[PDB]
Design a protein around this ligand. Sequence first.
Ligand SMILES: [Cl-]
Ligand SMILES: [Fe+3]
Length: 285
Amino acid sequence: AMKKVQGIYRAPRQHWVGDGFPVRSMFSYQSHGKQLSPFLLLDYAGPMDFTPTTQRRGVGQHPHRGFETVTIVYHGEVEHRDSTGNGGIIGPGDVQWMTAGAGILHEEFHSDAFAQKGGPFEMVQLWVNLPAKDKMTAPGYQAIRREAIPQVNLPDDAGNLRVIAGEYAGNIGPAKTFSPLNVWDIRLTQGKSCEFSLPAGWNTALIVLHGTLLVNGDAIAREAEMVLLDPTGTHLSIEANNDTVLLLLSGEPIDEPIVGYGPFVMNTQAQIAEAIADFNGGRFG
Ligand SMILES: [Cl-]
Ligand SMILES: [Fe+3]
């Protein structure tokens, strides 16, 4: 049975987050919290060509509690830091999987080397919800190098698929997750197709970053457009009308309340009050 298309969304207008992240917001939990669980948010930064500068372009220090932050870099370099000292630089092909859990205080910005040279800048920011029993887990980092991400060639020379989280054809993703989910990065060659088998009941989305994609032989998605699929079903097929780049997100739904405000995503409104109180009380970190 097919995971049939139940919603397709046009490219959103771009807004600026800080001075370093020109993003198009694909979805958020306010409107797609139940339908996209475990995924809370997807921003698509760029593509943008940045000029050399002495500025440190990025976003200021800000808190997070109750979920995980995933940064997938395609072009450019970003550096992340937190008030603890946990830091690092994410370059092309690299992934950072950040667990905010109990609470974190961090900032993201263009790396010092990217500031000097400029050039293409493109990446995805994804938020992954935590089960209630884990929403206060210790904050943790996972700097995932491009080399450590399996790259599986697709049958019929259709393209390749990077297994960031989950599993595909026996190749296991390096991302450590708290609940069952897949995060795949797919290049599909024009004229080629591929059919996938996913777990029944898993919420599934396709986000097209480049190209023209025909989903289940019906809907067509292009740059910055998103297909939301029926979670009831185990199958889907994609075809590349042009050389395509897409993200495939799929996960077992977290059947728990979502109460979120800005940087805090918890289970109860009382937990959001506690979160804001901790942050303004200086107890956050
Ligand atoms: Cl500086
Ligand atoms: Fe952040």
